[PDB]
Design a protein around this motif. Structure first.
Motif, mmCIF file in Angstrom:
data_model
loop_
_atom_site.group_PDB
_atom_site.id
_atom_site.type_symbol
_atom_site.label_atom_id
_atom_site.label_comp_id
_atom_site.label_asym_id
_atom_site.label_seq_id
_atom_site.Cartn_x
_atom_site.Cartn_y
_atom_site.Cartn_z
ATOM 1 N N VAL A 1 0.849 -1.186 0.000
ATOM 2 C CA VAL A 1 0.000 0.000 0.000
ATOM 3 C C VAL A 1 0.886 1.238 0.000
ATOM 4 C CG1 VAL A 1 -2.132 -0.886 0.983
ATOM 5 C CG2 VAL A 1 -0.189 -0.387 2.465
ATOM 6 N N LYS A 2 0.403 2.299 -0.636
ATOM 7 C CA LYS A 2 1.027 3.609 -0.538
ATOM 8 C C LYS A 2 0.158 4.472 0.365
ATOM 9 C CE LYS A 2 2.779 5.436 -4.170
ATOM 10 N NZ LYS A 2 2.844 6.358 -5.329
ATOM 11 N N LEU A 3 0.770 5.080 1.377
ATOM 12 C CA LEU A 3 0.065 5.872 2.380
ATOM 13 C C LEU A 3 0.576 7.299 2.313
ATOM 14 C CD1 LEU A 3 -0.016 3.474 5.466
ATOM 15 C CD2 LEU A 3 -1.762 3.877 3.721
ATOM 16 N N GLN A 4 -0.338 8.251 2.446
ATOM 17 C CA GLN A 4 -0.019 9.671 2.499
ATOM 18 C C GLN A 4 -0.374 10.192 3.879
ATOM 19 O OE1 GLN A 4 -1.879 12.145 -0.464
ATOM 20 N NE2 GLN A 4 -1.458 14.028 0.681
ATOM 21 N N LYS A 5 0.617 10.728 4.582
ATOM 22 C CA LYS A 5 0.355 11.335 5.877
ATOM 23 C C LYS A 5 -0.422 12.632 5.688
ATOM 24 C CE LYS A 5 3.474 13.407 8.240
ATOM 25 N NZ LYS A 5 3.092 14.627 9.004
ATOM 26 N N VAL A 6 -1.489 12.800 6.468
ATOM 27 C CA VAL A 6 -2.295 14.013 6.438
ATOM 28 C C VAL A 6 -2.590 14.434 7.870
ATOM 29 C CG1 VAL A 6 -3.331 13.671 4.158
ATOM 30 C CG2 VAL A 6 -4.366 12.606 6.172
ATOM 31 N N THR A 7 -2.754 15.740 8.072
ATOM 32 C CA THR A 7 -3.123 16.260 9.382
ATOM 33 C C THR A 7 -4.630 16.366 9.573
ATOM 34 O OG1 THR A 7 -2.936 18.563 8.633
ATOM 35 C CG2 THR A 7 -0.964 17.534 9.575
ATOM 36 N N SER A 8 -5.419 16.134 8.526
ATOM 37 C CA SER A 8 -6.871 16.174 8.630
ATOM 38 C C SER A 8 -7.470 15.427 7.446
ATOM 39 C CB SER A 8 -7.393 17.614 8.682
ATOM 40 O OG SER A 8 -6.987 18.263 9.876
ATOM 41 N N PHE A 9 -8.697 14.939 7.642
ATOM 42 C CA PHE A 9 -9.456 14.229 6.610
ATOM 43 C C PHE A 9 -8.712 12.982 6.129
ATOM 44 C CE2 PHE A 9 -11.789 18.309 6.063
ATOM 45 C CZ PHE A 9 -13.066 17.805 6.216
ATOM 46 N N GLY A 10 -8.446 12.088 7.072
ATOM 47 C CA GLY A 10 -7.813 10.833 6.746
ATOM 48 C C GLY A 10 -8.821 9.720 6.538
ATOM 49 N N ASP A 11 -8.373 8.658 5.867
ATOM 50 C CA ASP A 11 -9.207 7.468 5.763
ATOM 51 C C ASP A 11 -9.243 6.711 7.082
ATOM 52 O OD1 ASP A 11 -9.656 8.046 3.053
ATOM 53 O OD2 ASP A 11 -7.852 6.951 2.458
ATOM 54 N N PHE A 12 -8.159 6.774 7.850
ATOM 55 C CA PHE A 12 -8.080 6.129 9.153
ATOM 56 C C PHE A 12 -6.937 6.767 9.929
ATOM 57 C CE2 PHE A 12 -4.301 3.438 8.644
ATOM 58 C CZ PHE A 12 -4.120 3.520 7.276
ATOM 59 N N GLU A 13 -6.848 6.416 11.207
ATOM 60 C CA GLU A 13 -5.784 6.892 12.077
ATOM 61 C C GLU A 13 -4.823 5.760 12.407
ATOM 62 O OE1 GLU A 13 -6.743 9.030 15.588
ATOM 63 O OE2 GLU A 13 -8.063 10.463 14.575
ATOM 64 N N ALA A 14 -3.573 6.127 12.669
ATOM 65 C CA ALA A 14 -2.547 5.156 13.013
ATOM 66 C C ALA A 14 -1.623 5.752 14.059
ATOM 67 C CB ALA A 14 -1.744 4.739 11.776
ATOM 68 N N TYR A 15 -1.341 4.982 15.104
ATOM 69 C CA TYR A 15 -0.267 5.305 16.035
ATOM 70 C C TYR A 15 0.938 4.454 15.660
ATOM 71 C CZ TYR A 15 2.549 5.826 20.224
ATOM 72 O OH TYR A 15 3.579 6.079 21.100
ATOM 73 N N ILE A 16 2.062 5.102 15.379
ATOM 74 C CA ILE A 16 3.276 4.393 14.993
ATOM 75 C C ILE A 16 4.048 4.000 16.245
ATOM 76 C CG2 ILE A 16 5.336 4.448 13.571
ATOM 77 C CD1 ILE A 16 4.148 6.513 11.852
ATOM 78 N N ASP A 17 4.478 2.745 16.295
ATOM 79 C CA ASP A 17 5.152 2.186 17.453
ATOM 80 C C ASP A 17 6.629 1.935 17.167
ATOM 81 O OD1 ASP A 17 5.522 1.308 19.979
ATOM 82 O OD2 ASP A 17 4.116 -0.361 19.871
#
Length: 79
Positions: free
Chosen positions: A63-79
């Motif tokens: 998958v290709k993911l684009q970091k956004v500060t608003s209006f995301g498809d989902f949220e992720a906490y990076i560990d």
């Protein structure tokens, strides 16, 4: 492992991205344009539905993911 459409399950949810170097659930490439999903990176580990192991790659991701500060498809906490 998982496919491109796996993350679609977590629409308006929050998951935990576990950074690994071998045997990931998803090979992930971070982009600034034309992603498969837009993701909002969280500062909180709370309310994470699931732990997904991701390996950061620069070529041939699952998958290709684009970091956004608003209006995301989902949220992720990076560990």
């Amino acid at each position: 492992g998982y496919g491109k459409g796996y993350l679609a399950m977590f629409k308006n949810k929050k998951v935990r991205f576990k950074v690994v170097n071998s045997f990931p659930d998803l090979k992930v490439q971070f982009v600034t344009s034309f992603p498969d999903y837009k993701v909002k990176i969280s500062n909180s580990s709370s309310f994470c539905e699931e732990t997904i192991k991701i390996q950061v790659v620069t070529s041939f991701p699952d998958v290709k993911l684009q970091k956004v500060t608003s209006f995301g498809d989902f949220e992720a906490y990076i560990d």
